Structure 1
Amino acid sequence: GNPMWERDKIIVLGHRGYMAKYPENSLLSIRKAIEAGADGVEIDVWLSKDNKVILMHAETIDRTSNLKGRQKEMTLEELKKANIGMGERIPTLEEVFEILPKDALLNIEIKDRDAAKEVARIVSENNPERVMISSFDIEALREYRKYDDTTIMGLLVDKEETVPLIPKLKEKLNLWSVNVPMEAIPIIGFEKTYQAIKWVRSLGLKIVLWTEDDKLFYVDENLKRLLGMFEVVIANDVERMVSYLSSLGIRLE
C-alpha cells in the first residue's frame, strides 16, 4: 500500500520533535531528531484564532513558553512572540514541512478538531505519503476524513473502553494503526496489554508505541517483549532509542 510507512524496518519518530533534549514542538528539535537518525517526528497541532495551524501540546502556552494564553484564542503574530526554549518560536505546520526532508516522516497529532480542514490542505501540498494523522479525538479523525481519505491515520488510545470500539472505528475512519502508550503495561498489566495488541493486529491494524517516559520502553524489557508487534516507536530520546534498536540487531544505524 504505502511504502513510506509499510517497511520491514522499525520506524523511529521523535516525540514532539526530540523533547528529551530540545524544546518540545520546536523547529530546532525537529532538525536535531533527523540528524540523530529518526525517520521523522511527531508534532501536536492546534488552530490559531486567525486560522493558522500551529504546534503546541497543551491547550495553553503557559508551560512551554514565557507567555500566557489559549492559542485557539490568539493570532499568529501574538504567538511568534513567545520563546519556547533556546530562542525558538512557536512554529506553524508550513514551517515544519519546509524544515523537514521531503522524504522524512511526519506524524501530525491533531489536538483541535477545528484544525482538520487546514491540516488536510497543507498536507496535500507537501507529499502526503509520508504523513500520518493521529488523534485521541475521534471527531477530529472523522472531520479530517471529510477532506482526505487516503492519508495514513492512527487512533491514539488512552482509555480501556475505546479498545472494543476499534473494529468499527477502523471501518468508519479507515484506520491504519492504533497508537498505544507503554503506560498501559503497568496500568492494565503486561499480559492484558499484549493480548490487546495481538487482537488489534489480527484485525489488520499496525501498531505505534508511544510514551510520556522513555524509561517505560526499557524497564522490564517492555519494548523487547513486544518485538514483532509494532511498526513505529515514538521516542522522547531519539539517540537512546536508535542505539538500543541497533543493539538488538533489528535496526541499522
Structure 2
Amino acid sequence: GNPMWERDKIIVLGHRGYMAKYPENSLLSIRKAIEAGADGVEIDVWLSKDNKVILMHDETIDRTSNLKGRQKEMTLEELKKANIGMGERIPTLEEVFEILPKDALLNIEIKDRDAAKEVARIVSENNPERVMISSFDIEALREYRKYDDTTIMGLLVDKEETVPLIPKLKEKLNLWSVNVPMEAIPIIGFEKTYQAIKWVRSLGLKIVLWTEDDKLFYVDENLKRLLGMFEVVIANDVERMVSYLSSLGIR
C-alpha cells in the first residue's frame, strides 16, 4: 500500500514537534525532533483570516504566545508578530514542508474544517505519500476527502461512543488508522482498552498511540504490553521514546 506508513519498524512522531523540550508547533521543535531520531512530527493546523494554514493547537494564541487572539480572525502578518517561545514565530504549513526532509513523515491534525481545502492543496505539492491527515472532527475529515481521497488518514478518538461508529467511518472516510490516547488505560482500564484496540484492528485498521502524558507509555509497562498492536507512537519526549524502544530491542 503506502510504504511510508506501512513499515515493519515502529514509527515515532514528535508531538506538536517536540513539546516536552521545545516550543510547541514551532519550526525549531520540528528540526529538533528529526535530529533526535523521530521519523516525523505531528502538528496542529488552523486557517488564518487571510486563508493561510498556520500551526497552533488551541483556538487562541494566548497560551503559547505573548499575544492574544483567535488565529481564525487574524491575518498571517498579524500572527507573525507573536513570539511562541525561544524567539520562534507561528509557522505556516508551507514553512514546515520547507524544513522537513522530503521523506520525513508528517501527521497534520486538522483542528479547523475550514483549513481542509488548503491543506489538501499544499499536501499535493509536497509529497503526500509521507503525510497522514487526522482529526477528532469527523466533519473536518469529510471535508478533506472532498479534495483528496488517497492520503493516509487517521481518526482521533476521545469518546467511547465513537468506537462503535468506526466500521462505518472507515468506509465513509477511507480510514487507515484509529488514533487512540494512552489516557484510555486509566479511564476505562487496561484490559478494556486492549480489547477495544484488538477489535478495531480486526476491522483492518492500524493504530496510532498518542498521549498528553508520556509517563503513561512507561508506567505498568503499558506501551510494552501493546507491542504488536500499534504502528505509530506520538511522543512528547522524542529522545526518551527513541531510547526506550531501542532498549527493548525493537527499534
TM range (shorter): over 0.9
List aligned pairs for 1:54-69, cutoff 5 A: 54-69=54-69
SS of 1:148's equivalent in the other structure is coil
In the alignment, what sits opposite 1:220? 220
CA shift at 1:159, angstroms? 0.3
Whole-angstrom CA distance in 1 between matches of 2:22 and 2:116: 27
SS of 1:147's equivalent in the other structure is coil
Query: Residue deviations 1:211-230, cap 9 Å, x none?
Result: 00100100011100000000
CA shift at 1:115, angstroms? 0.2
Whole-angstrom CA distance in 1 between matches of 2:8 and 2:150: 21
CA shift at 1:47, angstroms? 0.2
Query: Residue deviations 1:21-61, cap 9 Å, x none?
Result: 00000000000000000000000000000000000000000
Q: Does 1:93 align with 2:88?
A: no
List aligned pairs for 1:90-239, cutoff 5 A: 90-239=90-239
CA shift at 1:163, angstroms? 0.1
CA shift at 1:235, angstroms? 0.2
Whole-angstrom CA distance in 1 between matches of 2:36 and 2:180: 24
Query: Residue deviations 1:113-162, cap 9 Å, x none?
Result: 00000000000000000000000000000000000000000000000000
| TM-score of the two chains, using structure 1 as the length reference | 0.99
Whole-angstrom CA distance in 2 between matches of 1:21 and 1:198: 33
Whole-angstrom CA distance in 2 between matches of 1:41 and 1:127: 15
CA shift at 1:242, angstroms? 0.1
CA shift at 1:245, angstroms? 0.0
Whole-angstrom CA distance in 2 between matches of 1:82 and 1:221: 40
Whole-angstrom CA distance in 2 between matches of 1:19 and 1:29: 7
Whole-angstrom CA distance in 2 between matches of 1:60 and 1:84: 12
CA shift at 1:96, angstroms? 0.1
CA shift at 1:194, angstroms? 0.2
Whole-angstrom CA distance in 2 between matches of 1:123 and 1:21: 27
Whole-angstrom CA distance in 2 between matches of 1:113 and 1:180: 21
| TM-score of the two chains, using structure 2 as the length reference | 1.00
List alignment gaps of at least 5 residues for structure 1: none
- Superposed CA RMSD: 0.2
Whole-angstrom CA distance in 1 between matches of 2:38 and 2:170: 28
Query: Residue deviations 1:182-241, cap 9 Å, x none?
Result: 000000000000000000000000000000010010001110000000000000000000
CA shift at 1:112, angstroms? 0.1
SS of 1:24's equivalent in the other structure is coil
Stretches (4+) displaced over 3 A: none
